[PDB]
Enzyme design. Structure first.
Site, PDB file in Angstrom:
ATOM      1  N   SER A  42       0.647  -1.150   0.011  1.00  0.00           N
ATOM      2  CA  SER A  42      -0.075  -0.057  -0.087  1.00  0.00           C
ATOM      3  C   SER A  42       0.765   1.393   0.147  1.00  0.00           C
ATOM      4  O   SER A  42       0.087   2.385  -0.052  1.00  0.00           O
ATOM      5  CB  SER A  42      -0.940  -0.053   1.201  1.00  0.00           C
ATOM      6  OG  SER A  42      -1.877  -1.090   1.053  1.00  0.00           O
ATOM      7  N   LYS A  45      -0.163   3.661  -2.869  1.00  0.00           N
ATOM      8  CA  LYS A  45      -1.150   4.554  -2.751  1.00  0.00           C
ATOM      9  C   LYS A  45      -0.707   5.854  -3.198  1.00  0.00           C
ATOM     10  O   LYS A  45      -1.505   6.735  -3.369  1.00  0.00           O
ATOM     11  CB  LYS A  45      -2.002   4.238  -1.673  1.00  0.00           C
ATOM     12  CG  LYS A  45      -2.642   2.845  -1.876  1.00  0.00           C
ATOM     13  CD  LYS A  45      -3.483   2.876  -0.644  1.00  0.00           C
ATOM     14  CE  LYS A  45      -4.603   1.772  -0.525  1.00  0.00           C
ATOM     15  NZ  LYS A  45      -4.487   0.487   0.193  1.00  0.00           N
ATOM     16  N   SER A 102      -5.683   3.678   4.195  1.00  0.00           N
ATOM     17  CA  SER A 102      -5.182   2.630   3.281  1.00  0.00           C
ATOM     18  C   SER A 102      -6.665   2.014   2.789  1.00  0.00           C
ATOM     19  O   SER A 102      -6.458   0.783   2.426  1.00  0.00           O
ATOM     20  CB  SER A 102      -4.375   1.876   4.177  1.00  0.00           C
ATOM     21  OG  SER A 102      -3.801   0.874   3.348  1.00  0.00           O
ATOM     22  N   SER A 209       1.135  -3.175   4.056  1.00  0.00           N
ATOM     23  CA  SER A 209       1.499  -4.504   4.544  1.00  0.00           C
ATOM     24  C   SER A 209       0.967  -5.446   3.625  1.00  0.00           C
ATOM     25  O   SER A 209      -0.062  -5.118   2.891  1.00  0.00           O
ATOM     26  CB  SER A 209       0.842  -4.586   5.833  1.00  0.00           C
ATOM     27  OG  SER A 209      -0.392  -4.281   6.228  1.00  0.00           O
TER      28      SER A 209
END
Length: 260
Positions: A42, A45, A102, A209
């Site tokens: 992530s 992003k 997230s 993660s």
């Protein structure tokens, strides 16, 4: 020495550690496996949100553009989008959700607006980042298989690009400040880099993660009496269902921001 300390940290860890710190006071660096590829998870992003910010510089209506959220859009982890099913979220709100919670649904909406993962890669390339690649959407971009090049970058490349994005030349002023605002308001990174720093230092970051115990964090750090620091800590392990290890990131951060 700092290098000996990172080595000792990695040897007991049960995985592979990647660190890149840039000290903007003198552009000096602290590097450990910083040219090796890791699955971003992530932390990717940030690049998707920034790509949309770049678009908004030439379209003053873009950030307030309505995006419809549907039940079918929901995937494995979407704490904000699930609140807005049947309604709409603005692209700004989706940036905020993707970066500060997230939210996987938010990420995918950003990717789909841009025209797919390849468009996020092209944006990274436009910033001089020749390493970054985004291949898949969320959540499959988190499979983090050892030796798989998909959805990877290096710690140095990501630190360089994050610096450019937050403190340097990549974005217009208003958009740069928005990115910084978003990263500072992240809610998911308490136990990672932040936990290795003096408590009153101002920090913005993005975690990530995935599988193979892949545990990542990328940060911009503003000390009280010094120029900013940019830090990438990536970590990944040999077995697919390994536990994630935020504690390793916190320990690396402490080691490389020591004394300073």
């Amino acid at each position: 020495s700092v290098q000996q300390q990172l080595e000792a940290l990695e040897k007991s860890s049960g995985g592979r550690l990647g660190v890149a710190l840039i000290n903007t006071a003198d552009n000096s660096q602290i590097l450990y496996r910083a040219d090796e590829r890791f699955a971003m998870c992530s932390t990717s992003k940030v690049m998707a949100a920034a790509a949309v910010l770049k678009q908004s510089e030439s379209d003053k209506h873009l950030l307030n553009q309505r995006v419809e959220i549907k039940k079918s859009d929901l995937v494995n982890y979407n704490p904000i989008a699930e609140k807005h099913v049947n309604g709409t979220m603005t692209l700004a709100e989706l940036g905020a959700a993707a970066l500060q919670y997230s939210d996987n649904t938010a990420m995918n909406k950003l990717i789909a607006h841009l025209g797919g993962p390849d468009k996020v890669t092209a944006f990274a390339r436009s910033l001089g980042d020749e390493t970054f690649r985004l291949d898949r959407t969320a959540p499959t971009l988190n499979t983090a298989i050892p030796g798989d090049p998909r959805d990877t970058t290096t710690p140095l490349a990501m630190a360089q690009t994050l610096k450019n994005l937050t403190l340097g030349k990549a974005l217009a002023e208003t958009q740069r400040a928005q990115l910084v605002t978003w990263l500072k308001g992240n809610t998911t990174g308490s136990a990672s880099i932040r936990a290795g720093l003096p408590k009153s230092w101002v920090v913005g970051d993005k975690t990530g993660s995935g599988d193979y115990g892949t545990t990542n964090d990328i940060a911009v750090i503003w000390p009280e009496n010094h120029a900013p620091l940019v830090l990438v800590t990536y970590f990944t392990q040999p077995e697919q269902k390994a536990e994630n290890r935020n504690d390793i990131l916190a320990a690396a951060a402490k080691i490389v921001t020591h004394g300073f």
